[PDB]
Amino acid sequence: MQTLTGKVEPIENVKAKGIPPDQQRLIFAGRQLTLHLVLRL
Amino acid sequence: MQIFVKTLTGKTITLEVEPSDTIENVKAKIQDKEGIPPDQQRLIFAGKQLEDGRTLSDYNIQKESTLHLVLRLRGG
Amino acid sequence: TIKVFTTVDNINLHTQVVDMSMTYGQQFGPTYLDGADVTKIKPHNSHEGKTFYVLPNDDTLRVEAFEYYHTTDPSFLGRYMSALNHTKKWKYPQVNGLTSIKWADNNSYLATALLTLQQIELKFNPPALQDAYYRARAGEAANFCALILAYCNKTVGELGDVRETMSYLFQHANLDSCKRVLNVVCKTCGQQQTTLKGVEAVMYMGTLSYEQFKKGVQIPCTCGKQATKYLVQQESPFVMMSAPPAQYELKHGTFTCASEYTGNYQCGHYKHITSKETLYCINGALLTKSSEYKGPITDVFYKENSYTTTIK
Ligand SMILES: [Zn+2]
């Protein structure tokens, strides 16, 4: 079943799926868990 | 470990720190030495602004490193 | 009952039927009309057809809010609206082609940032900032200024720092492709190269001079000796060079614009210096033209595209 600049089966696992999970924040329904990827650097 | 902090007057401060210390933790140690409120403090490593919520490890700061303490401006 | 529109972004409007015997708060949660908090207010006849901002209280409004503003901060809307009630009353004079702000409410740092933003190439990521910027460039800058205060966690009347303001706004800009390569050379230890990306690639604290950064600055090496640090490669549309405020000569044609800070670490005032056909000093609504400029400078902005050193 199918970033802020514009760039699975039913969060840690989607993060798992080069950028380590720890730098990834995922946003769905305007809430942190179309999903939104926010990056911490 | 120990790091050096250079102030605007040219005074050098010596701190005892760990790689896992957040920038917030290093600002607390400067307030112990110098009494400067953390909210005024801006720490710089070789020109790079160090940010709250990051660690000295995040910036690869090692023993005997020199930081520069500058102060926030207050423009109206 | 009357019909009204609720919104988080003032782009996507949601038709609502409101019970005129209950406050906006009871029906919508926190509610604002043109910046005014009407949460504790009952609907008025003249509210028919009007647009109200609401704090997101369902999945639609939460997605719309995040897509527009790029924050989940539940205080953001309240802080933005509180700021907008003040910034709507400021004056935004055109000063030789740039939108400035007449001095009010300790706003000189905000006016300096606004002037700088119109002179450097920056793409904002949040639609909120893209949309408000375009209005601000046209002279309608109240929303943009209120957003800058909200994003930077600043209150109207709070003293502020241009460097800090630009840094927070750069976190919301597309600087992904900006890159800086530095080398530090110790005659004992050898050479260490560092690469910085994004916001860290466009900021420097310790010299105002882009040319000095290219030529080399002396820094301590942890071996106990002095090393030389120099810029190897810069790929960005601009750089911001800062230093603790100090007397500095700005030479026509050698920089884009600059922040002058007069005063002390308790209280100061910003002016904006820009290099056009001659030097301009913008002080809110006031403009002075001069062939030379010396003053206490703390930020200098330079244009860039791609720079590579000739140092081997
Ligand atoms: Zn060395």
Author numbering:
A (entry chain C): 1 to 2, 7 to 11, 17 to 19, 23 to 29, 35 to 50, 66 to 73
B (entry chain B): 1 to 76
C (entry chain A): 4 to 315
The authors write:
The Papain-like protease (PLpro) is a domain of a multi-functional, non-structural protein 3 of coronaviruses. PLpro cleaves viral polyproteins and posttranslational conjugates with poly-ubiquitin and protective ISG15, composed of two ubiquitin-like (UBL) domains. PolyUb and ISG15 have common other structural features: ISG15 comprises two Ub-like (UBL) domains and mimics a head-to-tail linked di-ubiquitin (Ub2). While K48-linked Ub2 (K48-Ub2) and ISG15 are similar both in sequence and fold, the topologies of how the two domains are linked are distinct.
To reveal details of substrate recognition, we determined structures of non-covalent complexes of PLproCoV-2 (single C111S and double C111S, D286N proteolytically inactive mutants) with hISG15 and K48-Ub2. We have also determined the structure of the PLproCoV-2-C111S, D286N double-mutant:K48-Ub2 complex. In total, 41 of 76 distal-Ub residues were built using this electron density map. Occupancies for most residues were lower and determined based on R-factor values and inspection of Fo − Fc difference maps. We additionally interpreted the interface energetics for models of PLproCoV-2 in complex with Ub2 using two geometries of the distal Ub derived from the PLproCoV-1:Ub2 structure and our PLproCoV-2-C111S,D286N:Ub2 structure with a partial distal Ub. Our calculations of interface energetics also indicated that PLproCoV-2-F69A should have a larger effect on interactions with hISG15 compared to Ub2, including the orientation observed in the distal Ub from the partial model of our structure. Our structures revealed how the protease differentially recognizes hISG15 using both UBL domains, while K48-Ub2 is predominantly recognized using the proximal Ub.
